[PDB]
Structure formats: C-alpha cells, structure tokens
From a paper:
WD40 proteins are a subfamily of propeller proteins with no intrinsic enzymatic activity, but their stable, modular architecture and versatile surface have allowed evolution to adapt them to many vital roles. By computationally reverse-engineering the duplication, fusion and diversification events in the evolutionary history of a WD40 protein, a perfectly symmetrical homologue called Tako8 was made. A different computational approach was employed to redesign Tako8 to create Ika8, a fourfold-symmetrical protein in which neighbouring blades carry compensating charges. Tako and Ika are the first successfully designed eight-bladed WD40-repeat proteins for which structures have been confirmed crystallographically.
The concentration of negatively charged residues reflects their high conservation in the parental template structures, so Ika8 was designed as a fourfold-symmetrical protein, allowing the search algorithm to identify compensating interactions between adjacent blades. Ika8 produced two crystal forms in space group P63, with one or three copies in the asymmetric unit. In one crystal form of Ika8 this axis is crystallographic, but in the other (and in the Ika4 crystals) it is noncrystallographic. In all crystal forms, the Ika proteins assemble as trimers which stack on top of each other into pillars. Unlike in the Tako8 protein, the conserved inter­actions stabilizing the crystal assembly involve hydrogen bonds between the outer rims of neighbouring molecules, while the interactions at the top face are mediated by water molecules and are not conserved. In comparison, only the alternating repeats of the Ika proteins can be superposed, in contrast to the template structure where the overlap of the individual blades is much poorer. The symmetry is also visible in the electrostatic potential map, where eightfold and fourfold symmetry can be observed for Tako8 and Ika8, respectively, with the exception of small differences owing to crystal-packing inter­actions; such charge symmetry is absent from the template protein. The melting/denaturation curves show that the Ika proteins are more stable than Tako8, especially under low-salt conditions.
Author numbering: 1 to 318
C-alpha cells in the first residue's frame, strides 16, 4: 500500500483527472494539461490543454476529450498532443463530458447539451437541455441522460432529438447518474436517490438517503456509495435503501469517491485518502495523501490516482 511513482503535478489546482492503461491525464485550473507514464513517472506531453481552466476530461483509446471554462471542447491525440478535430464548443463553460465510441456529448453552464462526431466534427444535435447548469451527464447506447443544478433529469435519443420520457427529477442539485436498458438511477445533493422506468417514467423506488448534503456519488451494479460534507461514507443497496456496511469515514468533508470491485477509495477536504473493503467494512489503507483537498480520484487495476487543490498528482498501489 505505497506510492507507485512521484509525479511533478501542476502549478495550480487539479480540476480533472483521467486514467487509462499506464497513462494519466490531468487538468489544472490554469488550463494546463499533462500526460504522464505511470511505469516511468515521466511527463510525456506538456501544455496540450486550453487557455482557461480545464473543467472535464475524457480519455479513451489514445484520444483525450477536454472541456474548459471558455466553452472550448478539444479532441487530441496523446502521442503528439496535436488536435484531431475542431469542435466549435459552447459559449458557456463546459461542465460535463461524455465520450463513447465516436460520439462526444458536452454539457454547459447555460444548460445546453451538444452531440459531436469526432470523425467529421459535425454538430449532430444542439439541445436546450435544461434551464440550469448541467451538473452531470451519462451516455450509453445512443441515448443521453442528463442532470442539472435545478434537480431536473432528462433522457433523449440522438437521432430523433426529442425526449423519450419525462422524469420529475429531484428538488436539489443532481450529483451523479447511471442507468441500464430498463431503469435510470439518479442522486441529488440532499441525499435523495430515485430509480426510473425509462419506458413509462414511473418511480420504482424513492429513497430519502442517509446523509445531508452529499458531495460525491458512485453507482455500480445496484450498490451506491455516497459521501457527504459531514465526512461519512455510506454503502447501500439501491433496490431497498438498506445500508450494507459501516465505514468510519473521515473527520473532513468527503470531496472525491472512487469505486472498483469491492474497494472504495474516498478523499476528503483535508487531503486524507482512505481505502475500504465493502465486504468487511475494514479500513485497508489510511494514507496521508495530500496536504490539500482531494479533488479527483481514479481507481483501476489496484492503482489509485489522486489529485489535489495544490496541483499534486499521486498514484498508489493496494
């Protein structure tokens, strides 16, 4: 349970983080984007980003999709950092990104949602998504599910361009989403978690949650992991709302969550990173990760990658 590598990090707060293969892409509030090789810990690509704060990152098959505060959306190659396609982006700040096959879906602070083809650069769909800032976005199988700061959740089809079903949403800002072919599950800031039949729109379950002011959510299978400002990390079943295991949490506000296999990695505003086993509830690791708030966590193949508000990027083993 030590550090794999030292990484130089950035000169400003880490705002986005992506992890794939042995490559980590990190974005900072000064617009700089850096690419690192985990095996050697060397910075391969420097200054490939934007001129405003990086707000979202997507990394899939040697291609990085990055969004910035000025609304720009860039698609470039990790090998050379040269942009592949030119996207006009949004006029408002990018707030959410989804990347699947050749499609990029971007959400902005004005509520707009745009669908791009990263082979032609064409704007496939221009959407007046919500009357509020798009705070979450999930893309799967030709259908987009979005969440906004006003509590609204929406799903639509890319070709038709109209909504498939009307979901009532929440009454606080949405935090994280996920959905299957049959159901949608969404969670808001006040702890609410709701599941929706996509066809009819019916509310199959309405859970009030166990926390006040959640700051991070993570869905996988029917298990939700929720962190809150009070420092609690809770694991429970979305079908019934029953808590599964008890975790000590942190003495500081939860600011990042990662979830892989049966391992939960949580980061707090004091920089501490904790590693839990949801089968037993025991604390596997208790790292004094960073000296500032943990702003991003990536967890793949027993390797945790973390970023902090001081610009540091660390990578760990379990």
């Amino acid at each position: 349970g030590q550090e794999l590598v030292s990484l130089e990090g950035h000169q400003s707060a880490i705002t986005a983080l992506a992890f794939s293969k042995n490559i980590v892409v990190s974005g900072a509030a000064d617009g700089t984007i850096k690419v690192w090789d985990i095996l050697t810990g060397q910075l391969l690509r420097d200054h490939d980003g934007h001129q405003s704060e990086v707000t979202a990152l997507q990394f899939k098959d040697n291609i990085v999709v990055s969004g910035a505060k000025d609304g720009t959306v860039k698609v470039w190659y990790i090998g050379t950092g040269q942009e592949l396609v030119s996207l006009e982006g949004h006029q408002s700040a990018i707030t959410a990104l989804a990347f699947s096959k050749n499609i990029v879906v971007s959400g902005a602070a004005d509520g707009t949602i745009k669908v791009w083809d990263i082979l032609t650069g064409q704007l496939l769909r221009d959407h007046d998504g919500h009357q509020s800032e798009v705070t979450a976005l999930q893309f799967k199988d030709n259908i987009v599910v979005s969440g906004a700061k006003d509590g609204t959740v929406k799903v639509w089809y890319i070709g038709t361009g109209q909504e498939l079903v009307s979901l009532e949403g929440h009454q606080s800002a949405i935090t994280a989403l996920a959905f299957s072919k049959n159901i949608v599950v969404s969670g808001a800031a006040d702890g609410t978690i709701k599941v929706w039949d996509i066809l009819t729109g019916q509310l199959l379950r309405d859970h009030d949650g166990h926390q006040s002011e959640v700051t991070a959510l993570q869905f996988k299978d029917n298990i939700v992991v929720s962190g809150a400002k009070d420092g609690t990390v809770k694991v429970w079943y979305i079908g019934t709302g029953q808590e599964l295991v008890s975790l000590e949490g942190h003495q500081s506000a939860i600011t990042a969550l990662a979830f892989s296999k049966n391992i939960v990695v949580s980061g707090a505003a004091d920089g501490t990173i904790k590693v839990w086993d949801i089968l037993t509830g025991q604390l596997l690791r208790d790292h004094d990760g960073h000296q500032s708030e943990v702003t991003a966590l990536q967890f793949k193949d027993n390797i945790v990658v973390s970023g902090a508000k001081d610009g540091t990027v660390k990578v760990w083993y379990i």
